[PDB]
Amino acid sequence: HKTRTDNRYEPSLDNLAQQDVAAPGAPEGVSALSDAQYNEANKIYFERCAGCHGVLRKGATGKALTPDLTRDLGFDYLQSFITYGSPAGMPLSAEQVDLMANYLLLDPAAPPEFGMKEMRESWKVHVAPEDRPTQQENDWDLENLFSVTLRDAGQIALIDGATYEIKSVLDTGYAVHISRLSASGRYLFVIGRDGKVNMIDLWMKEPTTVAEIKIGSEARSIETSKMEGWEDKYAIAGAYWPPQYVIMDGETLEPKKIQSTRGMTYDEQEYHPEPRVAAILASHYRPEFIVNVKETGKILLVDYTDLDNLKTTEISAERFLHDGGLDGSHRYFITAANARNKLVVIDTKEGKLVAIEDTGGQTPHPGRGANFVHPTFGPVWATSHMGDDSVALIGTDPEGHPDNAWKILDSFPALGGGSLFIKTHPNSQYLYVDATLNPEAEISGSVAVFDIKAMTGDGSDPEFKTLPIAEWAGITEGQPRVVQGEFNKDGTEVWFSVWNGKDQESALVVVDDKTLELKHVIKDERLVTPTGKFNVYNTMTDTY
Amino acid sequence: EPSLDNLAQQDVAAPGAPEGVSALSDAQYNEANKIYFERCAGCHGVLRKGATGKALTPDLTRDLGFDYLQSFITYGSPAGMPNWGTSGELSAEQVDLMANYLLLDPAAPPEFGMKEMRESWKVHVAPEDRPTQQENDWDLENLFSVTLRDAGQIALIDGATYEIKSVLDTGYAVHISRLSASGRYLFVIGRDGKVNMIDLWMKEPTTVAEIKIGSEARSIETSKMEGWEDKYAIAGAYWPPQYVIMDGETLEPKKIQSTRGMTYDEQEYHPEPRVAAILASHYRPEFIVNVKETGKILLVDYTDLDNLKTTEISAERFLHDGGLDGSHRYFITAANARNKLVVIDTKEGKLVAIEDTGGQTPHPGRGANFVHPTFGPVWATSHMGDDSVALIGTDPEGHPDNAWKILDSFPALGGGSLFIKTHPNSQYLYVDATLNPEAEISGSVAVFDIKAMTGDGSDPEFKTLPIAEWAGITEGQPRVVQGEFNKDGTEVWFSVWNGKDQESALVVVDDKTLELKHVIKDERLVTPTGKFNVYNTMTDTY
Ligand code: DHE
């Protein structure tokens, strides 16, 4: 129940917590909470507790807290245990503590479902396909555009990769989690934490939302079809609540196929009523989407060639699947079962699990990870960790380097714990590692940079250069967190977000990759809480 | 609709009552809970979300109010809801208990996962310790496995001598018997979710392994793809909503899959999609699983249980029973409440057709395949809701215009039919009328002569066999049910199903003459229902 460096990246169900619920009746031995009391506790539960314990209280990273279990424990125990407080989220009073203890002793209702009728009611096509351009009608350099989340403003900025000019600021769902691009690079898809999806046509003279839809109450992932021949055919979104994924028309967003992720855990084979959808990727080898289902530890390969006779492969992997990426060849999916410190590898060509390996670190959090050619080991993919300062390398070349394939080849320290994103590009000799969640302001405001060319894999700890990103941005207020490297199309410049509060000063910092010197500082009154940044070309092509 | 009398034995605690509702005591609530599962959940659902009967969740029931609930339960309505109070089935006090129970929030029904299955799993004779060849002198392929429903037993009966070879104790109300592809192993599943596996090669065949796969179950099947004989068995449950693939030699539970998910058409989450018929493909190493409420047919590939390949086919809601055509390539199944037959191509793994039978509530069992003299290969079903028999063409290559089209429909004895039957060596098509309200019809079977069918649009005549009268049984109300042939297809057996404290029988009819051959009677023959010949079941010959 204490804040760690790796227990802050747990779901916060703040959109779902805005829904009012009814107070249940209380069985003998338990006291009922009033309407107000129950809702107040429920809002606290959904915001701060459901991430680890579940909205249904069947347990996730934290153990189940169902009524039968909590009534055996008793109020006093619950009261005392909750008095300490709970692990903080991303950067309780006496009355609240009692509310939570009492709430846990009552029978929870399941939040509303969100099916086809609800999706179709939210589904709006602003510009039908026939009314859209048939060629690019603006003079922008679309492939070198960066789509940047302006988190708390419920907007995104589209920024020129070469001139750093903000080309447009568009209204979207609240706190967009990620931007994804169609395979052709024409269509930009964004998903808000509230399950709102916007689809934007980059060919319009003034790009804007051409279609929108809501796919759930809580959602974090979206992806587009990337198999050759299937460009622009489909998009897919994944939700935390309800536990489901939805395949939508790539041109209109019409919801075509909704699949529940409720099911059995892979290992103990017990029913789990809240298996959240985490990362979603798209295969380059088959016409399939790659869907991580967290609590059950299943990776789904979903064939989108026929949605009525639906072929899937449900791969037993490891529990607590979160994020991941494809290797350099784009054949193998490498993903973190973070709470179990493991990297699961799937062969997307053959449709099967190939390996599961412990990184030796605490809570691997790769993002999409970093693929590079290690001077001694050959092709490798890398991840950093939230729980410690380590960077781990896994071999990704079964054909050319069989002895190194799917083995952890090295592990070495970077700036500190609380890292979220590691980054490189084929044209760069550098490996960048952030330390976003580190409690030390100077560490959280800097990035470690390793010289891949100097790496020998002799067992020593490779040295790194420390780039003072937040210092370069010149922000005197607060303790801004630096997060997520993203390259430009040419792989010559790498951008970082200098993420401060909504009413505080933020920036983007552009680093010249060849020299590791400051290239440019992006500041604008409209640049509020900049977080994720996605270069059109690097996102459409999965170049990382 | 089903009766979930196994969930009723579970004792639950009295839930709380929100503002504006009375609470029931522990005893009252438990009494109401038992009634709810024993008599109500079939139609209304375990979770009260509604199946054939409307949803009875607290949000809906509280708007209706106590008086409305009391009245509806007392008097019922013409649209399929029994008059519990005025019929005397429920006392006045029990009616009120049920109305009050419906206003309260139900305690979640118990799940039944791997830990629970493994705890119930018993291997009486390890594979190594079993015979290596048949150690009895029985003609196993001509043996019949007969359910003695209310006695929680089955009877192994010799197909030629009609001798009851053995009466074995199994789960309560075994629903069906199924055979492994080699014909060695006999699998039975009780309504309670209890599975028994019996080794027919033993000197005295008995249960060699057993396991429980859920609270309420109706289906079991064995792997029938060439090369996969005896490898797996699969069981399907009504509750929890799931199927489980088990080791074909030990019953070890290997893979449990939930069937909770989205309806095919409106795409709305359904929390209780019951598993209905389960068949086994002869074209791929797959199981064919009907999921009723969501209208999905699952093709589950058992070649790799860790990297599990399935095909989830959108079909039609209310899927129940069905069978393979004569070629064993196409699965034809009744989406019964919608009066449709759904056809799946098991080779290509896709839906090929959905056709209305023109009848009310088709109920084929596994159906009846034959070569119609003018139409070609056809598959037939009778109906629960009317007296009709419908034929569908099953030959897309050889009779293209006729394929997957209803080619003819004609009357048999009356409504309430459950099973239609034929065999490749017979020229006759037998149709029961088990649930008909008239005793003369419920105790008789219609027999059509396939050779005389002209498909000229006229209705084919049938002979009426007085099966119950042949048995010498009038006492109570004996209902005749389900034709099953012997291995040679020269005799057909029917069950004369009477009450547990009444006299039942099995009637053996000579297929060549359509005359009474033999009547099987025994004090042990309590409530005989399903009968399965070893050879015809192992080979899917129907
Ligand atoms: C499931 C998931 C993905 C993979 C998406 C995909 O494959 O399309 C992901 C990726 C991401 C990515 C993808 C980067 C990439 O290069 O792919 C980014 C930038 C991101 C910025 C943040 N994430 Fe993320 N993130 C969650 C979940 C996820 N984040 C959370 O449940 C969580 C922990 C809290 C929450 O309630 O949302 C969380 C907090 C954050 C942040 O505090 C971040 C830093 C800021 C923010 O804007 O809200 N998450």
Ligand code: DHE
């Ligand atoms: C899901 C299912 C199947 C397919 C099994 C398979 O594929 O392995 C089936 C088949 C069957 C078969 C298979 C015949 C065949 O030749 O395949 C038989 C004999 C049978 C005897 C009965 N069934 Fe059955 N049956 C149900 C369900 C099912 N019955 C019910 O839910 C229902 C409607 C009510 C109930 O509570 O069980 C019901 C009533 C009956 C009867 O009243 C029968 C006659 C006796 C009994 O115990 O309930 N059912």
Ligand code: HEC
């Ligand atoms: C993720 C970091 C957590 C958050 C946020 C909250 N809890 Fe938690 N809780 C978590 C863990 C890792 C554990 C220990 C057991 C385990 O799963 O390994 C717990 C434990 C509890 C308990 C104790 C129950 C017991 O059986 O001893 C309670 C009562 C509990 N948690 C309640 C609770 C509440 C009310 C929270 C919101 C403020 C909350 N937890 C947040 C992990 C996490």
Ligand code: HEC
């Ligand atoms: C299947 C034959 C049923 C069984 C067994 C029970 N019920 Fe039922 N019920 C059924 C149907 C098809 C309907 C629909 C209403 C109609 O007009 O026929 C109902 C309805 C009810 C209702 C009314 C709900 C409403 O009007 O919205 C109630 C309160 C109800 N049923 C209760 C109930 C109980 C308590 C039962 C066990 C004793 C029971 N039903 C059995 C079908 C069937």
